[PDB]
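Hi team,

As requested, here is the filled-out complex form for the PLX run. I kept the field names the same as last time so the parser does not choke. Let me know if anything looks off before we queue the next batch.

— J.
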Amino acid sequence: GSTFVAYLPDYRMQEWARREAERLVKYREANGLPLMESNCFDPNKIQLPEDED
Amino acid sequence: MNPFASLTLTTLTILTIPIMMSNSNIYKTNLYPNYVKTTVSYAFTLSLVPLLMFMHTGQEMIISNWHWMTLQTVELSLSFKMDYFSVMFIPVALFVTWSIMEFSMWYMHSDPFINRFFKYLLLFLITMMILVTANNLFQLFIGWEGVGIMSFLLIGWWHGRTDANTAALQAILYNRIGDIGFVLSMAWFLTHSNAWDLQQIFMLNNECPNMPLIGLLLAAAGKSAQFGLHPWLPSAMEGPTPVSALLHSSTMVVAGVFLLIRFYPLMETNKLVQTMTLCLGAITTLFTALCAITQNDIKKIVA
Amino acid sequence: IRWTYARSANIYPNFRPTPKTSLLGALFGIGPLFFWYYVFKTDRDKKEKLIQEGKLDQTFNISY
Amino acid sequence: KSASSLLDLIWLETILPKTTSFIQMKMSIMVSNQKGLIKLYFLSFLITIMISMTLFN
Amino acid sequence: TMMSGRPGRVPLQFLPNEARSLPPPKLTDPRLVYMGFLGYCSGLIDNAIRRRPVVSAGLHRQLLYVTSFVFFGYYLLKRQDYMYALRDHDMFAYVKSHPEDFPEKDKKTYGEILEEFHPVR
Amino acid sequence: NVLQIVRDHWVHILVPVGFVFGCYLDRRSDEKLTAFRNKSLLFKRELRPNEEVTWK
Amino acid sequence: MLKIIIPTTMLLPMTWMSKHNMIWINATVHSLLISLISLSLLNQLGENSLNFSLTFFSDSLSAPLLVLTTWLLPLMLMASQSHLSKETTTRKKLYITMLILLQLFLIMTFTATELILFYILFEATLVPTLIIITRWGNQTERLNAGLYFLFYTLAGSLPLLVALVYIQNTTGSLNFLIIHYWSHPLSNSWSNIFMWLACIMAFMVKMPLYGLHLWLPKAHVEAPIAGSMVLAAVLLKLGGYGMMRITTILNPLTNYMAYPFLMLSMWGMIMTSSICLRQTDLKSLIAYSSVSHMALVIVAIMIQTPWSFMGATALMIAHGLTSSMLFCLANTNYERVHSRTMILARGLQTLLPLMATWWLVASLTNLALPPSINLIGELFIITASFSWSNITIILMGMNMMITALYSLYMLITTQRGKYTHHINNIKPSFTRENALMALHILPLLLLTLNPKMILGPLY
Amino acid sequence: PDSWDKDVYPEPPRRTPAPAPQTSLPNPVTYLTKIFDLLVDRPVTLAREFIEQQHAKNRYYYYHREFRRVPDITECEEKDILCMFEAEMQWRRDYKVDQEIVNIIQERLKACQQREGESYRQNCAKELEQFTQVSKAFQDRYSDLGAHYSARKCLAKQKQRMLAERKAAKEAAAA
Amino acid sequence: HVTKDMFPGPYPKTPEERAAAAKKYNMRVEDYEPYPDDGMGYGDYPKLPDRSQQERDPWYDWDHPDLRLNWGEPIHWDLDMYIRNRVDTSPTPVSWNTMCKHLF
Ligand SMILES: CCCCCCCCCCCCCCCCCC(=O)OC[C@H](COP(=O)([O-])OCC(O)COP(=O)([O-])OC[C@@H](COC(=O)CCCCCCCCCCCCCCCCC)OC(=O)CCCCCCCCCCCCCCCCC)OC(=O)CCCCCCCCCCCCCCCCC
Ligand SMILES: CCCCCCCCCCCCCCCCC[C@@H](O)O[C@H](CO[C@H](O)CCCCCCCCCCCCCCC)COP(=O)(O)OCC[N+](C)(C)C
Ligand SMILES: CCCCCCCCCCCCCCCCC[C@@H](O)O[C@H](CO[C@H](O)CCCCCCCCCCCCCCC)COP(=O)(O)OCC[N+](C)(C)C
Ligand SMILES: CCCCCCCCCCCCCCCCC[C@@H](O)O[C@H](CO[C@H](O)CCCCCCCCCCCCCCC)COP(=O)(O)OCC[N+](C)(C)C
Ligand SMILES: CCCCCCCC/C=C\CCCCCCCC(=O)O[C@H](COC(=O)CCCCCCC/C=C/CCCCCCCC)COP(=O)(O)OCCN
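And here is what came back:
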């Protein structure tokens, strides 16, 4: 059981996340983009309620 | 390539082989103490090489070999620091420990559990080497607690004696009082600097606030037996003379001071904590010398 | 056996509500709770006010 | 004195379990202590009928 | 839901004719298996009470217990399924016949809905 | 001795039989939740030349 | 998930049909095999969960608890095999049946995709424990203990049921997935306050909270060794699992309502740690240590941060293993001494050295010595509390100091010193007891190598 | 080493001085490393060649998993559970990727601090600024969600922040 | 082997029950002194001197030499507090007040 747990497949997506971050940083650094953005969603598709106060 | 890493990890690795062999047949014979002493001497003469390389070049390293759990943006890994402090303190500690076991060969000649005594000494040496070479705060805490537990076990070596158990519990109590400040410093460093690594801690703290340094100072006072938490060090002389010579005189009791040495980049940027440290040291040395100048037990005077 | 029984099992049947016992129980069982509640509440309101004014400098504060 | 005996063994025991036990014992004794005389039960039934007629309408 | 006065209900009918338009429960239904298990437990208790070898006293008696339990469970499952089908049919018919009490909600995306945020501190 | 140790060691087969029956019943319950097989937006896929279902 | 449930159900027929002198061997072997089977649930995903079906699902919070529950049964059987030697075959089979039923109920409880099913199994676990405590108990007070262990629980759990069904009338579903995805904020109202209390106190009573911890010393002292093991290791974690599952809908009202329970736990940890210092009973001391650790877990759950949840899961697993080991060691002492008093038998290290080593390791792992998972959970909870408020560190450090004090006090009083002269029936420790200690301790030192396996879904 | 890309983890050209023995005494360091080479490096290298040939005899490959893009929580209906599930899974994947990005930046910072030695305060200002930017972004994204975090809560926090920003900008423009 | 009458009871109010309790705890009636009758549940347990076990005679042949206790003699209510590993009340060469003042 200890050997089975030790060699469990990477279903938690640790190496996958690391490789995705590697390629994403490689893209953004080359393109000059400011790494991670402050907004998790694109503000263009968010419709704010206008106050008019 | 670059034998500095191989040698500086091999010393600590070969320091652990007799612990592995403690379940073998050699542990049941009378050649076990000689085995441990020979291992320690070989470790010292092997660690003499990284010291030579550092003196020649000034070479320093960080060896982050094994990756432990990663917690969101915080990464914990088995990382060893081989700066000037580690590569200089390891040979001295190994030399002193070699001398101590050679002395204990004759001093513990009539003790039935002499192999267990040598195993305890080696385990304390391993924990102290873990403490000295630690690159992050969790490994430093591991060494901090290992040396304390080994001191507790060695003070109460004669467990039929009430006073030995009392002294061991006293030492544990005072070291936990220091542990409070140690844990406070760990929590503050993780919360604000987002890491326990020494490099990130040094980088993100250009002007260190009071609280983490006060926690470190409390931990150092607890482990080094400053004036507030001093009596456990005098009371620790209940253990066998090799234990008093190795742990409570030259290697373990300096550990707290070593901690304040490790965080000196943050120490110099704060003035109040420096004043507190200086005052505590002065009052401690004065009070301890004044108590010493009138004792009758020689071991108490040396402590 | 007498020592253990008197220490553990003989306490309540001999208990009597007395001004000494009532006051001591109220103190040692209520006072610390309200004291720590006041301390933590004051600290957390101070921290929340500092966050609302934005003068706390929470840079590099990622793990919580 | 305070942690073990005063609070853990006495007052925490007095508040939740012992008070409940005493109250339930008292109410059970009061309710069940009927001598078996149908006169009292019938008078109580008459009082209940009057209360129901004068209160639930 | 009080179906006692539902129109066109035969008084003492266990299973109406329209219930025959519903799929019968399978012979391997887990509820039927549980009813058979209950019958087996009843047989074991019957053996235990009468001071007989519990597992192997009466095979015919235990098998009769299991069979009767399975029979009654099958018919009970049929009636239960019919009643639930009736309830769903009535609810859907009432929703269809009364559109003004069940209006069609305007579909809005989370990008145009303002939900208050409560920080955890 | 066969037909003698069986009367005493037949109880050892109950748990593995229960395990294999539980695996079969897990597949039983799995087979009833295929309403979205090869239909999620994340794994919309064209079937292989000799493939009928993506997962069983 | 039935690949685990069905073998546990088949454990009953096997026990009853088993030869009169082969019940223990078959039960132990097949329970260990079932634990090996349940080991497969550790392979979790960073995605939602392991949704097996509409009725049962797995998670990296449920997986370690399920593994521990499956692992505990062989240890319970090995511990119980000793004192049931003079007992008739039918009643020994009944004892094994109670243990198997408890394990089955716990296994079904930890999956519980729906909250009403979770409540049903969570309250069904009560009956076998009550039967075990009130039937196979030594002292005359066991009955009283059982009553306490019953009614306290129900006093907290009956309102919860009402709240639960009320939620299903408002939300429309008590399924955990729909509840998480469709969660809406709670308005600060009296009705919402009382719904919060009804949802919370049911799990707070079983942890137990400092105010409501009275039943635990009685239940732990008067129960047999298996009862003490199952109470300390798994049954206390049901409240924590329920709280972590149910606090999703309680926000944002949790911020205001957490204060009384946070204060109660932060002071009751100190109170129980100090109570441990003056104790003339081993089982009572272990019970109060369990109360302190579960109070820390309550603080972690109420803080409601990712580090809080990770430390809470790690601490529950570590505390379960450690408390089971401590109870086993105390029972091994009691079986020789028959007094259950710390000061009566002394200097046992002289007579039983390997058992003294087991005692030392148990005390060290209860002392939260790094890098044990006990220390990992304690440190994560401490850091989360410091982030919550910097003043909690004083109480946490005081608790650590008193914990070390009473742990080493327990070790020194029983193992060190001079042996009692008039006691001469102290026979060498058997292979069974040593194997029990080893099987208790090795998983802890193996799990410290892979902490992420027990850190929960927020890792 | 080809095992990792140099661009994500940049390194300086690592210039090193040449030995300039001012005296004729033989330094023990050179002889010590020569005997270390002869006694350690050669057998390890030979064993590595043996293992590498054995690996070359049996070659097989694994591929990095690729994920399609799915509509996020902003394009999901109020009670539509399928799109909400897909958006939540996508948001969790993005959260993990962001955590790994912050990990990479912190690794860069640690490496720079250790490498530059005594002049770490000046020679690693770029890494500190990069970490400040990425940490500010990460904190703005996920600081106060707490346990039971979700895409909806992140969107609500972003909406609150953007409403505050719009109000502040409107006030400043009309000030 | 312990009977019901050999367990602690309520506070003794008359001399007869005081003598009975003194006989129960294996001590003279003159030496017997229960704790003051207040709310705390001491019942009828001897209020032995608050002296610690460290300053008991270390040369007497005790049945438990480490604890310095005899077999059948009554046990102090706070025995676990005085076990030679904890607070001791041994007299000191200098008075308590003088040491307090000097240290402060
Ligand atoms: C989640 C659901 C899943 C689990 C289901 C659980 C329930 C299922 C069973 C329900 C009841 C049906 C069976 C019970 C009948 C009672 C008979 C009995 O006493 O046992 C004696 C009998 C052996 O003794 P004997 O040689 O006949 O003569 C001795 C006398 O009988 C009597 O000897 P004695 O009078 O000299 O001994 C005196 C003793 C005898 O007194 C008793 O034992 C009375 C029996 C217990 C009462 C049953 C109440 C009704 C069921 C309630 C279940 C509650 C569940 C909820 C959880 C809470 C737990 C309370 O009484 C006492 O010692 C007084 C104190 C006892 C402690 C306090 C009372 C606690 C009892 C609660 C037990 C509840 C679970 C029962 C489990 C089954 C036990 C047999 O046991 C058996 O052999 C029958 C056991 C079952 C047969 C298994 C055969 C199947 C294997 C082949 C087929 C393979 C299946 C798979 C197919 C695919 C494979 C290829
Ligand atoms: C007696 C004196 C000693 C003599 C023996 C001397 C030898 C000493 C060696 C023993 C300890 C020294 C430390 C050496 C550790 C090396 C092994 C380690 O690296 O493996 C760990 C593996 O350990 C396991 O992960 C942890 C053990 C599993 C825990 C499950 C417990 C077993 C089930 C029993 C029931 C559970 C009960 C409790 C409920 C939860 C971590 O592996 P990891 O770096 O990550 O990646 C593995 C490789 N990958 C990358 C391909 C994946
Ligand atoms: C405790 C568990 C339940 C056990 C019940 C006893 C089991 C043995 C009974 C044997 C068969 C009895 C059925 C009678 C045959 C025909 C019945 C039929 O003519 O009556 C119909 C109705 O059929 C019966 O009512 C159904 C009886 C079935 C009882 C089973 C339900 C048990 C509750 C769930 C627990 C699960 C128990 C499973 C194991 C038995 C028409 O009713 P109707 O004239 O129009 O209106 C009167 C009723 N109203 C007023 C409420 C509307
Ligand atoms: C015994 C061992 C432990 C067991 C468990 C104990 C923990 C349970 C305690 C529950 C927490 C407190 C309950 C209600 C807290 C609400 C906050 C309140 O205290 O603050 C003020 C509330 O004011 C006063 O407190 C009014 C209530 C006074 C009546 C309560 C009795 C006080 C002492 C009784 C304690 C007994 C509890 C146990 C009963 C068995 C704020 O005033 P206001 O802004 O206007 O109200 C805000 C709430 N609104 C918006 C819904 C209206
Ligand atoms: C170990 C013992 C612990 C006991 C736990 C008891 C604490 C739980 C709170 C008391 C029970 C309340 C159950 C309510 C179940 C939730 C349902 C709900 O909250 O809905 C509310 C109903 O709320 C209530 O009615 C609650 C009233 C309370 C009645 C019973 C009082 C019991 C004792 C109260 C005092 C104790 C308070 C703290 C107890 C803590 C335990 C020590 C809304 O009602 P509506 O009419 O539908 O609203 C329409 C208009 N918006």
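Two things worth flagging: Residues 141 and 147 of chain H are 15 Å apart (CA to CA). The pocket of cardiolipin (ligand 1) is lined by residues E 41, 44-45, 48, 53-55; F 17; G 9, 13, 16-17, 90-91, 94, 97, 101, 104, 127-128, 131, 135 (CB under 6 Å).

Thanks,
J.
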